[PDB]
């Protein structure tokens, strides 16, 4: 029935956070979503900040690593920087992969953090209409 989206970032920590957060508002009809990292660098508080000036909630979100058993059930992985992409493990034969670059938002102004929070709207909203 409900398909699986796997959102990765190199920490779990920014735009995957986002994504999922996005995720689970625009796609959660017919969507399971998730997220994780190649290393857990904590769920960024700017993240769960933006989050929250949309009004999504991320305050309950976990950085958590990559999970064999979750992967095995994704039908679509998606690696949200090129560490990720570069990094991501042997995927299984039936899990579809795709790269969507985004800026990494830490570390750059709080405003520019707020556009990689929409740049991951926007895309999200694109894949829905696929
Ligand atoms: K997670």
Redesign the pocket.
């Given at each position: 029935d409900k398909k699986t989206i796997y959102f990765i970032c190199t920490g779990?920590s920014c735009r995957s956070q986002m994504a999922?957060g996005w995720g689970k508002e625009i796609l959660g009809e017919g969507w399971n979503v998730?997220?994780?990292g190649i290393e857990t660098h904590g769920v960024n508080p700017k993240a769960i900040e933006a989050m929250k000036e949309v009004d999504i909630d991320i305050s309950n979100?976990?950085?958590?690593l990559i999970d064999n058993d979750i992967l095995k059930q994704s039908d679509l992985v998606v690696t949200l920087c090129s560490d990720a992409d570069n990094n991501c493990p042997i995927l299984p034969p039936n899990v579809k992969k795709e790269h969507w670059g985004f800026d990494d938002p830490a570390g750059k102004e709080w405003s520019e953090f707020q556009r990689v929070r929409d740049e991951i709207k926007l895309a999200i909203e694109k894949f829905k209409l696929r």
């Open positions: 779990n999922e998730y997220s994780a979100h976990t950085s958590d």
